[PDB]
RNA sequence: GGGAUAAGUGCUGAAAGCAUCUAAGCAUGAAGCCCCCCUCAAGAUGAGAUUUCCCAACGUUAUAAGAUCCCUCAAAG
RNA sequence: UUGGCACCUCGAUGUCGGCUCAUCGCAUCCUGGGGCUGUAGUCGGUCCCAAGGGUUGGGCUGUUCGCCCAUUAAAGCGGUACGCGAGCUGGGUUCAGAACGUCGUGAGACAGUUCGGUCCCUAUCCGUCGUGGGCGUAGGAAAUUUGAGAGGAGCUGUCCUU
RNA sequence: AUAUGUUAAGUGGAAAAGGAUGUGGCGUUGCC
């Protein structure tokens, strides 16, 4: 359950460490995003030498949430943290590596390269 | 359609008619179609 | 085209063919009997009257609704049936396809049927604007003395009155509600139970009416 | 001159049975019936019919002209009928007979079906030529109008369904 | 989804030989109008309808069907 | 709107902005229908019909306004005591303290600024939201009902295919 | 109500420049 001003750790090597949610995309008056949704965010903290610098306004896809998601079979997955991956226009990650497990739901959103790069899909 | 209080022929083929109480101009040139209003 | 009366027992879940989780409402629809056929000729419109739950027979000095009174006993005896606790009409059925006094079993509905379920919603008592009409609170701090009040109720000299339909505190719930396009998940002939996808209005033990969806 | 005052030469096959104010024209090609104006005289000879007006007001001249025109149209439709011709311009634009109804393929995702009415018969000769024949002039015109309005002609290439002999205003497109 | 329409689009058609959607007629055409959907509703004093139950004597006294008072309560408050 | 006039109110008709809650107009922001185009298409321009529904979360400022960030189908313009303080707030503005600039010999003052600075009221009538008692409805009653009429609802994006 | 006529816009029952084969009364005239 990500909203405006929510801060998320970044789960790639793009150079961003922490971002702050500026906007949840997808229609007027939408308040909350979850796994697989795309957000607009600003980089609050960044690793020196990285591509993405502090202060940049970027787009990211949520790959882990504490609220988690409910699946069609009545089963649930929840994670201990909220994390996102910075993406280009065509949904590909801006970085080369993905860290941490990601939810299966990214397959439905066609974030296939992020799925392939992740150490674990759950 | 031109909708304006001043309806009058623009070219020589324009015809002034009255349809359902509205003064109109009909013409082969579609730019000259007018309805008073 | 179909209709039946039942009591809401409670909510549970079943697993579909694909392993999907389907929340369901258990409706028990035993003892349904056609009590009367109303026709255009006599009543001005076509309907069947269905009694749902059997009552005790009449006795002198009965103090409660558990025992049929004489008018009810006579009305039911006209259909060769026991007196019934709940009686409702169905105008969506074909009057020809029913005989007075016949039973209405759950097997009239089949799995996959699309139904409309009508019942009386749960009562909430006297409720304020926040809960009854979904209004927003005032600030809880910053000096505010406005938390759960309804706010302004009109303008001024114009119109010097409150308009009809202004949303205000009052009794909430206990209203007739129809939920459309539910589905029959399963019909169980024993126990005379219909499993309805999703939730239906009302408290447990409340009466519900099930009809083939009009839409 | 004048239209309503003009006389009508009825056909020898057509039996213009003047049912009083109402009229009914049974002919070789069909029958027609519509009540003419209730303020007109329709006195006729054995081989001819000539309408006369009883007044001189504006309504008199207007009603006289329209009544005589309607009578002449009924006579000509009983005798010879009426033909409306539609032409289809455009690659892949075709029409065909699905029995009595007419199917048009005019570039939409779907075909359009034009159903036949009483005393109306359709006919599509080639792939891209259609025809609407019948006794009643107004009905033939209306059906042809609907067929044309399924996909009216366009200015840049003349594509669409046009009347035979229709002048379509053309415009160069700034491609 | 149906019906009638708006701006429009026409057909037939004169007044006005022509032409013309209009004057008589004939159609078609909007998230809009009236219905279709949900809820309330006969104090609708115009107070409606159906089924069933009950039937007194001499204003009074006691009653019928039916209810209430009182009491145990909750799914209601 | 800025005004002009000084007709109601000076034995008091609480002023700006916001909050809560709306309601109406249409000169229509979106969505629907359509004519013209210097309309190829994709997009536009302009005009006509149309008020059913919809029409945003932040940075700055007391602000309205406005600029900006990010969205959205769209982020319409107006009326209702510039709607709404016996519904709220009280940042601003017409209060006593103090200070600066400035003016004044001065007490003091302001096409100015700055820090601080009590928001009372148990609802009688109409109005509104709920909920009961009486009587009427040509016998009394139990239940099921028709619907004159009334209210509610009414939005729209993206993708695939063609 | 009576006589003669005008209007077809509910004009009557709130408005202008301007526009218009709406309809009625008057004329001076031209071709035929
Ligand atoms: C909180 C109680 C006071 O209310 C108010 O102060 C207010 C909030 F109600 C108030 O200011 C009202 C609204 C005022 O009326 C406005 O006056 C304006 C000039 C015009 C306006 N309208 C017409 C445009 C009027 O509505 C005024 C003049 O009160 C000062 C009303 C008059 C009748 C007035 O003086 C009354 C008597 C006033 N007052 C002097 C308070 C004087 C200030 N004060 C004293 C105390 C106090 C005293 C003793 C003990 C304690 N603990 C506290 N607390 N506050 C009291 O002793 O009591 C109240 C009612
Ligand atoms: Mg001009
Ligand atoms: Mg709030
Ligand atoms: Mg408080
Ligand atoms: Mg009654
Ligand atoms: Mg003023
Ligand atoms: Mg004076
Ligand atoms: Mg004053
Ligand atoms: Mg006074
Ligand atoms: Mg308008
Ligand atoms: Mg609207
Ligand atoms: Mg708006
Ligand atoms: Mg105000
Ligand atoms: Mg205030
Ligand atoms: Mg007030
Ligand atoms: Mg202050
Ligand atoms: Mg000095
Ligand atoms: Mg302070
Ligand atoms: Mg009704
Ligand atoms: Mg009423
Ligand atoms: Mg949509
Ligand atoms: Mg009028
Ligand atoms: Mg008027
Ligand atoms: Zn012209």
Give the length of chain C.
215
Give dist(CA A118, CA C88) in Å, integer. Answer: 60
Nearest ligand to residue C149 Cα: 4
Q: Which CATH architecture has domain A1-122?
A: Beta Barrel (2.40)
Give dist(CA D139, CA A6) in Å, integer. Answer: 69
Å from CA of C151 to ligand 16 middle: 24
Do chains A and C touch by CB distance (3+ pairs < 8 Å)? Answer: yes
Of the candidates C87, B31, B32, C138, the one whose C-alpha atom is nearest the C-alpha of residue B17 is B32
Which DSSP category does D169 fall into? Answer: P
Give dist(CA D163, CA D167) in Å, integer. Answer: 9
Contact A36, A109 (CB under 8 A): yes
D19 CA – E40 C1', rounded, Å: 58
* C-alpha distance from C130 to closest chain A C-alpha (Å): 21
Tell me the domain boundaries of chain D: 17-81, 82-172
Angle between the D137-149 and D58-79 helix axes, to the nearest 10 degrees?
Answer: 80
Domains D17-81 and D82-172 share a fold: yes
Q: Is the peptide bond before C159 cis (omega within 30 degrees of 0)?
A: yes
User: Strand runs (DSSP E) across C16-168, as ranges?
Assistant: 21-28, 33-38, 47-51, 87-90, 114-120, 123-127
Residues whose CB falls within 8 Å of the CB of residue A30, separated by 6 or more in sequence, listed in order: A24
Which DSSP category does D77 fall into? Answer: H
Give dist(CA D49, CA B29) in Å, integer. Answer: 41
Give dist(CA C176, CA C123) in Å, integer. Answer: 11
User: Strand runs (DSSP E) across C39-188, as ranges?
Assistant: 47-51, 87-90, 114-120, 123-127, 170-173, 176-188
Contact D47, D9 (CB under 8 A): yes
Kind plus residue range of the DSSP H or E element containing C41 = none
Q: To 5 degrees, how large is the angle CA C13–CA C18–CA C19?
A: 40
Give dist(CA C15, CA C53) in Å, integer. Answer: 31
Closest nucleotide relative to residue B24's CA, C1' based: G20
Residues A46-77 as b or e (16 or more Cβ within 10 Å = b): beeebebebebebbbbbbbbeeebeeeeeeeb
Listed residues: CB within 5 A of ion ligand 24 = B 10-11, 13-14, 27, 29, 32
Contact D27, D79 (CB under 8 A): yes
User: Residue D79, SS3?
Assistant: helix
Q: To 5 degrees, how large is the angle CA D67–CA D73–CA D78?
A: 130
Give dist(CA B10, CA B32) in Å, integer. Answer: 6
Give dist(CA C43, CA C34) in Å, integer. Answer: 16
Kind plus residue range of the DSSP H or E element containing C31 = none
Integer CA distances (angstroms), C115 to C31, C33, D87, in order: 20, 20, 52
Give dist(CA C119, CA C85) in Å, integer. Answer: 15
Contact D64, D40 (CB under 8 A): yes
Resolution for this model in angstroms, one decimal place?
2.1
| Chain A positions in Cβ-Cβ contact with residue C20 (cut-off 8 Å) | 72-74
Contact A71, A77 (CB under 8 A): yes
Three-class SS of chain A:
CECCCCEEEECECCCEEEEEEEEECCCCCCCCECCCCEEEEEEEEECCCCCCCCCCEEEEEEEECCCCEECCCCCEECCCCCEEEEECCCCCECCCCECCEECHHHHCCCCHHHHHHCCEEC
Q: Do A73 and C13 touch (CB under 8 A)?
A: no
CATH code given to domain D17-81: 3.90.930.12
D143 CA – F40 C1', rounded, Å: 31
Closest nucleotide relative to residue B5's CA, C1' based: G19
Give the length of chain D.
175
Of the candidates C133, C93, C119, C124, the one whose C-alpha atom is nearest the C-alpha of residue C198 is C119
Q: List protein-proximal bases of chain G (any atom < 7 A from a CB).
A: 9, 16-24
Give dist(CA C171, CA C173) in Å, integer. Answer: 7
User: Residue C155, SS3?
Assistant: coil
| Chain A positions in Cβ-Cβ contact with residue C15 (cut-off 8 Å) | 73
Q: Do A72 and C13 touch (CB under 8 A)?
A: no
User: Residue C66, SS3?
Assistant: coil
Give dist(CA A42, CA A23) in Å, integer. Answer: 10
Top-level CATH class of D82-172?
alpha beta
Give dist(CA D56, CA D43) in Å, integer. Answer: 18
Neighbors of chain D by Cβ distance (3+ pairs < 8 Å): none
**Cβ of C20 under 8 Å from any chain A Cβ?**
yes
A99 CA – E66 C1', rounded, Å: 79
**Cβ of C152 under 8 Å from any chain A Cβ?**
no
In the PDB record, what is the listed experimental method? cryo-EM
Closest nucleotide relative to residue A3's CA, C1' based: F57
Handedness of CA D151, D155, D156, D157 (dihedral sign): positive
> For E64, which residue's CA is nearest its C1'?
C70
Residues whose CB falls within 8 Å of the CB of residue D89, separated by 6 or more in sequence, listed in order: D128, D153, D157, D158, D159, D160, D162
Q: To 5 degrees, how large is the angle CA D93–CA D97–CA D101?
A: 105
Integer CA distances (angstroms), C196 to C23, C92, C183, C186, in order: 9, 20, 6, 7
Contact C197, C213 (CB under 8 A): no
Integer CA distances (angstroms), B2 to B29, B35, D155, D158, in order: 12, 6, 20, 25
User: Residue D58, SS3?
Assistant: helix
Contact A80, A65 (CB under 8 A): no
* Cα pseudo-dihedral D160, D164, D166, D172, rounded to 10: 40
Residues D144-175 as b or e (16 or more Cβ within 10 Å = b): beebbebbebeeeeebbbbbeeeeeeeeeeee
Written as one string, the DSSP assignment of B8-36 is: --SSTT-EEEEETTEEEEE-SSGGG-EEE
> D129 - beta bridge partners?
D87
Residues whose CB falls within 8 Å of the CB of residue C42, separated by 6 or more in sequence, listed in order: none
Tell me the domain boundaries of chain A: 1-122
Q: How many CB atoms lie within 10 A of CB C58?
A: 15
């Amino acid at each position: 359950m990500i909203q405006q001003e929510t801060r998320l750790k970044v789960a790639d090597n793009s150079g961003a460490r922490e971002v702050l949610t500026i906007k949840v995309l997808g229609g007027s008056g939408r308040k909350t995003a979850n796994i697989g949704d795309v957000i607009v965010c600003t980089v609050k903290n960044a690793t020196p030498g990285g591509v993405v610098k502090k202060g940049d306004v970027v787009k990211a896809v949520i790959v882990r949430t504490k609220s988690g998601v409910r699946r069609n079979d009545g089963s649930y997955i929840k994670f201990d943290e909220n994390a996102c991956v910075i993406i280009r226009d065509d949904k590909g990650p801006r970085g080369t590596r993905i860290f941490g497990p990601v939810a299966r739901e990214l397959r439905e959103g066609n974030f296939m390269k992020i799925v392939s790069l992740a150490p674990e899909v759950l | 359609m031109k909708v304006r209080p001043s309806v009058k022929p623009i070219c020589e083929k324009c015809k002034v008619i009255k349809r359902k109480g509205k003064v109109m101009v009909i013409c082969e040139n579609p730019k000259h179609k007018q309805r008073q209003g | 085209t179909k209709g039946i009366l039942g009591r809401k027992i409670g909510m549970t879940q079943v697993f579909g063919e694909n392993g999907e989780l389907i929340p369901v409402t258990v409706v028990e629809a035993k003892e349904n009997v056609v009590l009367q056929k109303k026709t255009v000729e006599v009543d001005g419109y076509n309907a069947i009257q269905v009694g749902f739950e059997d009552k005790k027979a009449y006795k002198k000095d009965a103090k409660s609704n558990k025992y049929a009174n004489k008018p009810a006993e006579g009305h039911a005896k006209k259909a060769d049936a026991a007196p019934k606790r709940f009686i409702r009409e169905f105008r969506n059925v074909d009057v020809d396809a029913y005989e007075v006094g016949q039973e209405v079993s759950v097997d009239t509905f089949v799995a996959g049927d699309v139904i409309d379920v009508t019942g009386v919603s749960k009562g909430k008592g006297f409720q304020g604007a926040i809960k009854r009409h979904g209004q927003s609170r005032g600030p809880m701090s910053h000096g505010s003395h406005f938390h759960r009040a309804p706010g302004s109720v009109g303008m001024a000299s114009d119109a010097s009155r409150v308009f009809k339909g202004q949303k205000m505190p009052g009794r909430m719930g206990g209203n007739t509600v129809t939920v459309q396009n539910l589905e029959v998940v399963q019909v169980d002939t024993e126990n005379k139970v219909i499993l309805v996808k999703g939730n239906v209005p009302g408290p447990k033990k409340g009466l519900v009416e099930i009809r083939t969806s009009i839409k | 001159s004048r239209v309503g005052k003009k006389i009508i030469d009825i056909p020898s096959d057509v039996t213009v049975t003047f049912d009083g104010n109402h009229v009914t024209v049974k002919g070789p090609k069909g029958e027609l019936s519509r009540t003419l104006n209730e303020r007109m005289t329709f006195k006729q000879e054995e081989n001819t019919i000539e309408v006369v007006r009883p007044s001189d007001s504006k309504e008199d001249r207007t009603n006289h002209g329209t009544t005589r025109a309607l009578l002449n149209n009924m006579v000509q439709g009983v005798s010879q009928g009426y033909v409306k011709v539609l032409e289809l311009v455009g690659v892949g634009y075709r029409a065909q007979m699905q029995g009595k109804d007419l199917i048009l393929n005019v570039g939409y995702s779907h075909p359009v079906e034009i159903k036949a009415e009483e005393n109306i018969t359709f006919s599509v000769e080639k792939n891209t030529v259609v025809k609407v024949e019948g006794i009643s002039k107004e009905q033939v015109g209306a059906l042809a109008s609907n067929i044309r309005s399924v996909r009216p002609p366009e200015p840049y290439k003349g594509k669409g369904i046009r009347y035979q002999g229709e002048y379509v205003r053309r415009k160069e497109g700034k491609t």
